[PDB]
Design a protein around this nucleic acid. Structure first.
Length: 52
DNA sequence: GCGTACGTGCGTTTAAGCGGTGCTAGAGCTGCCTACGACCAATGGAGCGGCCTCGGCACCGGGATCCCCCAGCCGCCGGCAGCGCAGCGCCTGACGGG
């Protein structure tokens, strides 16, 4: 089997794979819906793009 | 120092407020079923570390503005001092009256 990054699978650049781990250790919740981080990383890329 | 407009007061008046219906919507809960996220074991390559070389920026030196300033300068005008004078009330003539 071959693996592909999730960021590409969303057509995104920011590290969905990394940021998902952050909420897991961030203790904001005990369980995270897998859909949430993909949404989250998308937001940041929009925000960062807006400023520069 | 000026002046208006907001405080005080009076006189309507009206919608808040009370007390009264009557309703069902929607929140609260339960039963029950599902899926989806955590967990585990593997895997490799994206990311992070370590070099390492050009040029974007720094810096300089010089020339180029360019606002900043202000006396020059005049126009203007009004005040002002002097001058000519307009009008009036008295002064004083012309002439009859006293």
């Amino acid at each position: 089997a071959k693996a592909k990054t999730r960021s590409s699978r969303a057509g995104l650049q920011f590290p969905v794979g990394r940021v998902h781990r952050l909420l897991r250790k961030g203790n904001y919740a005990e369980r995270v819906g897998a859909g949430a981080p993909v949404y989250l990383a998308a937001v940041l890329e929009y925000l960062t793009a807006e400023i520069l």
